[PDB]
Amino acid sequence: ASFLSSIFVPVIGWVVPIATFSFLFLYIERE
Amino acid sequence: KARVIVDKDPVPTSFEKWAQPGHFDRTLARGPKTTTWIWNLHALAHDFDTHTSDLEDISRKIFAAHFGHLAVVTIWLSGMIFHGAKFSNYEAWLSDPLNVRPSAQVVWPIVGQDILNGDVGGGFHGIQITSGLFQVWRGWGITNSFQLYCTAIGGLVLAGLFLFAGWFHYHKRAPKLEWFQNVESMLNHHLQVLLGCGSLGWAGHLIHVSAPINKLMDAGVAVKDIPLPHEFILNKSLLIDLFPGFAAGLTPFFTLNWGQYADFLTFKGGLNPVTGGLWMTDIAHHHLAIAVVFIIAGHQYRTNWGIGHSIKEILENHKGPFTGEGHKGLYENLTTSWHAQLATNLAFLGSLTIIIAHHMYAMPPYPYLATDYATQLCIFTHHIWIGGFLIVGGAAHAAIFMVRDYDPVVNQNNVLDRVIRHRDAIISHLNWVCIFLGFHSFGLYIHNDTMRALGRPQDMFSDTAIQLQPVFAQWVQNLHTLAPGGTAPNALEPVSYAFGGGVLAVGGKVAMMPIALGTADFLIHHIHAFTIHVTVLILLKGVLFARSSRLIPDKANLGFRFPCDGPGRGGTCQVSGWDHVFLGLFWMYNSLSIVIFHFSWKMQSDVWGTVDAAGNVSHITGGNFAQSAITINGWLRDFLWAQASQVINSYGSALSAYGLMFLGAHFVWAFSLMFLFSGRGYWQELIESIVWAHNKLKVAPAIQPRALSITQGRAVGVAHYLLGGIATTWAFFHAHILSV
Amino acid sequence: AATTPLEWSPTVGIIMVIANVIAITFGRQTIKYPSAEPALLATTAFGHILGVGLVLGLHN
Amino acid sequence: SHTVKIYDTCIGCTQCVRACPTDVLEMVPWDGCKAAQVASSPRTEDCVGCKRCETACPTDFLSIRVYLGAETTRSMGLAY
Amino acid sequence: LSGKTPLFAGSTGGLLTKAVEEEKYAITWTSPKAQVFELPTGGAATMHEGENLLYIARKEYGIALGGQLRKFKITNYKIYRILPSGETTFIHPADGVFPEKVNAGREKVRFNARSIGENPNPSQVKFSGKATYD
Amino acid sequence: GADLTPCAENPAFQALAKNARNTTADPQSGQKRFERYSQALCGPEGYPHLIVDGRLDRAGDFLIPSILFLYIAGWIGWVGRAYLQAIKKDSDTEQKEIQLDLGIALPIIATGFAWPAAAVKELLSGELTAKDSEITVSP
Amino acid sequence: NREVVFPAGRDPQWGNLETPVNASPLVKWFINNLPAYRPGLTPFRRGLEVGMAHGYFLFGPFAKLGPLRDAANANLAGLLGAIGLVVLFTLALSLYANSNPPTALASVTVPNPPDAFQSKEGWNNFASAFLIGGIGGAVVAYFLTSNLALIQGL
Amino acid sequence: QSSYLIKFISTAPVAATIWLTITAGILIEFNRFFPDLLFHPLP
């Protein structure tokens, strides 16, 4: 099942940073 | 109104003030309650402005202090030629300048250090020299030791005269403030006499002594067969045989028939094929043209005969629409503050010294200098460094003028006041430029360094790949190669073979060849521009913000040298104009260090190397610069790791001292990091515990010991950081090039 | 090939002469502080440069 | 924000008030028989915390300290 | 609030966006002469013979200026705090007497009757919500 | 003794002795060096090794140098301690520290050859140590 | 001739300075009539014109210099790579919009209040238009460059 | 006066330079006659 690396690697490099930094930036800037 | 005004016997000459220290200042004159008094004694010895406020007392110290400094330089210069007289191989070096290496230092047969006196050549055991004094004396037409022995005693005699002068002036005959303030007289004298007549005189020596003698020496005559200089003057038959223009005499000069002197006042502009070096006749025609220009130029100013310019009128009348009052008030600042004059003189003198180093390597002006790669490399590296230090000193005294001597009344809507009133825009854009260059100068290395590791050499910024060529410089190169004919028609050969043209070969060596500019030079030239802009940002910021900042409104009151102005407002650490100079020195060292590295690898890879009869030039490093200097690992591999083999393996040979100074230099660099990273607070608490042990055993010092001051700890570090740094590449440059 | 030089000729001296005269007329009006004692010695010197500049400059 | 606390070792030299950049400290009358003046810190909100008050105090150890705390625009020296 | 502006061409060093949004400051002074004085943020400026007024971004600029004014023998300098809504408050010489000189109306604040050695340890005061400097 | 042989009989030592590279101006400095080093112990590499065990068979290595140091070093400390104490009774103490009173110092430097006797005398009864209660300390 | 540089407005107290680059006739028109400051437009139309300019700009670097530039699918990589960058640019607007962005500033070149970017709605509508116009500009640049030989071949 | 000159010599640097040069010259001169001295040769 080598295709999983093609799906799980970029999720760690792109999806996880975007989602985490997106929520955090709104959380730290909340009022 | 130029006049000689003097005060008779202001200051006595007693030995009293020698004993009691701190006489110059009142705070230190009280007593040494603390060890910081010791460090403050040296830091305030030359701060004459702090000792007194009367400009007469300041200027008299400065004018006399210069004389004591000249004695040190004359003793040095006289000392160099003295070693050439007694302990040297110069007399043997002239017999064969291509097989005998130059040496003038001999270390005594004491513990293990006779090794340094290896077989340098010519039956002499001595340390090999890289200053190039041997080539200078040949340019001076010195062919025997007794001639050099006479010149050394003359310098020592001259040293006493300068030394007598500073005594005579500060103590017996002190000029008044008016004597120094007559600027218009000073500038005429230095341009005409010190530079003009000094240049005109040296033309006489070159024409009468150096050019004829060197013209016999390169021919192939023995050193003993050469007549002495006075023999040429008295016996004109010998002079006419070489340069027949002298047969006409001095009449062609006065009658404007100057073409008769074409034999020894040439404009060939190329290098002598026999001895790697410019033609003596071309150098002879140099200073004669320079002297006339300088003699004429110095008559510009008035100097008390109604004829000439007032510098105040020149500056005031250069106003404009954009600049409010133009250069009004600058003459007053420069005539009421020594630091302003010091800043201008230091900055442009340093840029001059860098400008020398670039001219000399491409246009070797001495005989057999180009073939001696060791002398050529250290000579370029030397003046490159000295110019860097002096430029940083210019920014320091520029800022010291602001805190100490700035008058807002004078600088009102002038060119300087208008500069301070938009300082934010100057730095914010320079900030943008520094970031832009650092990305697009260094990021291109990382892209190459990253791609080659990924097995993608096609995606690099290299000569086969995307290459960014320096088209602008290559265009300017071709204009110089074509200056023979057309523009500059009388010139036979270009000003330098670095721009282009044919190769020159002396013996088996190559003196100079065309320096091709490719993608590697395009990157490194931007790296230099990057590193130069940042130190300007650090230094220029200190000058503008020394008076005040948005953070600190009153920064001048604290002074030029204050550590922090408190820990609040976040943190105000290193906010002074002093600390900017401290930071700029690291960047000066960073920028300047790549320049000499750019010089070493390029000249070894592209320029220098053995040459065959068929013109095949076997370069030293084998042309590896183009495909390896584009990556950072290439420098680490091909330049540092590879060329340092001679240094580490120098043990058990004559170059062993370089391996020691090389290794020792890394220590002082790391020892610097004690003071830069740490802080005074920890060290005072450590001394507290140590003082307890002395109070226990009753070895307590009367002078209470304290840790070093804050600005001192920063000063002590950068002194080590630079000394340990420069000494490292100093030995690497020496041991590597001396072996090859 | 060296530039062609100049044998002595009386025509050369008239260029030096006229060069001095234009200098005297040029300085006498425009010099801010003409008299201090002088300027005659100075203005004649400039004419020698302009003369030597014209004299050698013409014949090339 | 930055708390400025004064202790009983004051002697009314007034050197702390003259050093304050932001005019945080103000001398006040000591009702007791010590002196006609002892320091105070009414406008503590403008304390940037440059410790100039402490450097000017002539005691063995300080009669006035500056205990740092929460930051604000006035304390951080921000003109923006 | 009244006065005349010091005559200077302008400068980047000066007022920024903070003034519109929150707490710009001002300083007022009166001088008999018209000298040249260095501004708090770079530059030089002249001063009129009556009721000079300058707007400054912070309180530190004013007292730093006031110290420079004392060199010219000017001791009547008043600093204000102008809020975005126009509310102005007279601050620096809060009473007619300056801070360095004593006035009877004032009261001591944040005074500890003990010496620094007498302060409690932090372990004696933890989780209570009080600090050692109290 | 550990992984070594006598220096006189070791082959590697004799190999280096032929090419000794005399240090001083004396021509035989190299041969004279290796002659004296034959007494010491040498390893496989050919260089000598010193044993600081304290055995009297090999005491010139460290033990004799050790005694010669401490007599010299205690001279410096006893002199400095006495010169500092004598100054403290005088009025201007700090200046005398910088500008040395050679009249006071050279008599002290003349002494110090008998520093161990004075050290024991101060230790048995005297001023070698001040009391802990009368010395500055942090809280 | 007389001075060219003046203080921002009548007040010299303020920071900004009137300069040729800041307050010339030509520069004031261009900047104030750019879509980010042009009068008489809604927040949606501003973002559309801005994105349409940027998608057309961002297609080039990916195509002619990115990987596979020397391949058949070079121009296709520029379109997909640009859209991925436009989406991140679109996402950034939504975060700056949904974080209560303070205000837009008024300088000398744009003396009036710039636009109705003073709320979350103005920035959110700007973001939706950026993606629509942004993807459009890249798609346009792809079809031209890919079919530029045909357009010249006509 | 000579009294002032003696005080100059008695200062910290000149006293240190004079003394250290003497201690240096002893080790320097002793090492040229007695070359190596790795250890004390024991009879």
Ligand code: CLA
């Ligand atoms: C850790 C995770 C990760 C992953 C999986 C990738 C993956 C990739 N990077 Mg990358 N990168 C990363 C982290 C990562 N990166 C980080 C942290 C950095 C900072 C240094 C970079 C910096 C970087 C640069 C500078 C470049 C890449 C490029 C690439 C691509 C090269 C593929 C190829 O063979 O040539 C290309 C082969 C092709 C067939 C064309 C690729 C077409 C793209 C990938 C299609 C993308 C569609 C897009 C997501 C559409 C979304 C729309 C939707 C949201 C509506 C590949 C997709 C290169 C590139 O140009 O990609 C375009 C490139 O130049 N990356």
Ligand code: CLA
């Ligand atoms: C003075 C300038 C000028 C120029 C350079 C042209 C040029 C042209 N005209 Mg034209 N025209 C002009 C003035 C001009 N006209 C005036 C003043 C009038 C009024 C009388 C006309 C009336 C006119 C008519 C009635 C027609 C033309 C047509 C044409 C094209 C015919 C070329 C051909 O041989 O067949 C065709 C060759 C080709 C290679 C195909 C051309 C494809 C077009 C030109 C591509 C245009 C794309 C365009 C730039 C998109 C615009 C958007 C952009 C602004 C962002 C040619 C491009 C003919 C046409 O149909 O063009 C399509 C046509 O029917 N013109």
Ligand code: CLA
């Ligand atoms: C002839 C003997 C003589 C005597 C007795 C004096 C006596 C005096 N001079 Mg004087 N002077 C002399 C010669 C002499 N000078 C000469 C030849 C010059 C010209 C250079 C001067 C220039 C001069 C100036 C400009 C000033 C004095 C001052 C003074 C007074 C204070 C000096 C002092 O205490 O510092 C004693 C300091 C030293 C002994 C150290 C001097 C170090 C020398 C000059 C340089 C050594 C460089 C060296 C090679 C660096 C190596 C570094 C490295 C190896 C470690 C004192 C009355 C000062 C004064 O009046 O104060 C108000 C003052 O401002 N003098």
Ligand code: CLA
């Ligand atoms: C023409 C050259 C020149 C001159 C005349 C001056 C003169 C002056 N400078 Mg200055 N400066 C210069 C160049 C110059 N500088 C350069 C090139 C730099 C950049 C590095 C500086 C950086 C600088 C700073 C940062 C400061 C000055 C200051 C001063 C003033 C007081 C300095 C003092 O007390 O001296 C005595 C200085 C010392 C005792 C320091 C000793 C440093 C040693 C020599 C470093 C060791 C180098 C050595 C070669 C190492 C090898 C040998 C060693 C291992 C034994 C004085 C007016 C100070 C000041 O307050 O001005 C108002 C000040 O703060 N300057």
Ligand code: CLA
């Ligand atoms: C190697 C060490 C190092 C580096 C990299 C820097 C970097 C910098 N210093 Mg510096 N500095 C250093 C050591 C260093 N310093 C030391 C030791 C000192 C003490 C003397 C100083 C003192 C100092 C001063 C006093 C000043 C600087 C300034 C600067 C900046 C210049 C602007 C520039 O080049 O653009 C930025 C360039 C870089 C950061 C180079 C590398 C960037 C690569 C190519 C890009 C990265 C790829 C990719 C985006 C990574 C993404 C990863 C992802 C997963 C997150 C820059 C941030 C100046 C400044 O800020 O002016 C603007 C300034 O005034 N420094």
Ligand code: CLA
């Ligand atoms: C900072 C310097 C720098 C530069 C110039 C480049 C350049 C490049 N890299 Mg690279 N890279 C760098 C640092 C750099 N790299 C670093 C530090 C790393 C390590 C992480 C890498 C790692 C890396 C990888 C792994 C890859 C590249 C690739 C590439 C290429 C494709 C670029 C691309 O698709 O971006 C697209 C860029 C954009 C969409 C933005 C462009 C911005 C434009 C130019 C702005 C212009 C402003 C304008 C002039 C001003 C307007 C004025 C107005 C008033 C009108 C290109 C040659 C790829 C390749 O294959 O190389 C051939 C690739 O796969 N890079």
Ligand SMILES: CC1=C(/C=C/C(C)=C/C=C/C(C)=C/C=C/C=C(C)/C=C/C=C(C)/C=C/C2=C(C)CCCC2(C)C)C(C)(C)CCC1
């Ligand atoms: C001279 C000058 C200049 C220059 C300019 C430039 C350089 C320009 C830019 C350019 C650009 C930057 C361009 C761009 C453009 C773009 C376009 C042209 C776009 C397009 C679009 C479209 C058409 C789209 C559409 C669509 C949509 C929206 C959706 C759906 C799809 C479609 C496709 C339909 C400047 C100003 C700087 C300065 C001054 C002067």
Ligand SMILES: CC1=C(/C=C/C(C)=C\C=C\C(C)=C\C=C\C=C(C)\C=C\C=C(C)\C=C\C2=C(C)CCCC2(C)C)C(C)(C)CCC1
């Ligand atoms: C005009 C203007 C300006 C300026 C500007 C400049 C001059 C510049 C900029 C610059 C910039 C701002 C730049 C940027 C760049 C970026 C880049 C360089 C990026 C790249 C990226 C990449 C390469 C990635 C890719 C991708 C994606 C996106 C997704 C998927 C995956 C991948 C990886 C494929 C200002 C601001 C003032 C204002 C407005 C106007």
Ligand SMILES: CC1=C(C/C=C(\C)CCC[C@H](C)CCC[C@H](C)CCCC(C)C)C(=O)c2ccccc2C1=O
């Ligand atoms: C080590 C260190 C110190 C302590 C360094 C000290 C105290 C240096 C001491 C230098 C010499 C050793 C002082 C004593 C010299 C003797 C008087 C000489 C004896 C005489 C014989 C040599 C002849 C600081 O004070 C400091 C301050 C700020 C930042 C970093 C640091 C820092 O790193």
Ligand code: SF4
């Ligand atoms: S910390 Fe600074 S601002 Fe606060 S009272 Fe002390 S000196 Fe004044």
Ligand code: SF4
């Ligand atoms: S002790 Fe300190 S705080 Fe008290 S009056 Fe004196 S200087 Fe001010």
